[PDB]
Write a protein that binds this ligand. Sequence first.
Ligand code: 5SK
Length: 113
Amino acid sequence: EMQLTPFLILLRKTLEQLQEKDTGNIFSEPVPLSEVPDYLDHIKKPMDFFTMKQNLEAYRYLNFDDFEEDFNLIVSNCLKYNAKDTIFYRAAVRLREQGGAVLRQARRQAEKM
Ligand SMILES: CC[C@@H](C)Nc1nc2ccccc2n2c(C)nnc12
């Protein structure tokens, strides 16, 4: 029960904060299926920050849970696809931790709306 514009402004800011936590930009764009040809054999729904931005501006995120669900896919896909002893796997663990704090704060501000 809130206004659409301030909510989208908040998701835009939150998405920028999450992208800032991904310092290697390894989640900024879709996993290049031509460089990882078996990726879609394992990953039911790829997700990345660029796609999240397009979804945001297409009005696909009208509540905080749908935004956070796609962030969680970025993390879970990476944990699933990559072995534990890799930089990619540990980067998804770090993003889960650092991103989770960004999301809790942003969700509090959405609840103020
Ligand atoms: C051996 C498969 C590894 C290299 N997987 C990934 N490669 C990526 C390459 C470019 C951008 C993202 C990539 N990625 C992500 C995200 N999760 N796993 C991989």
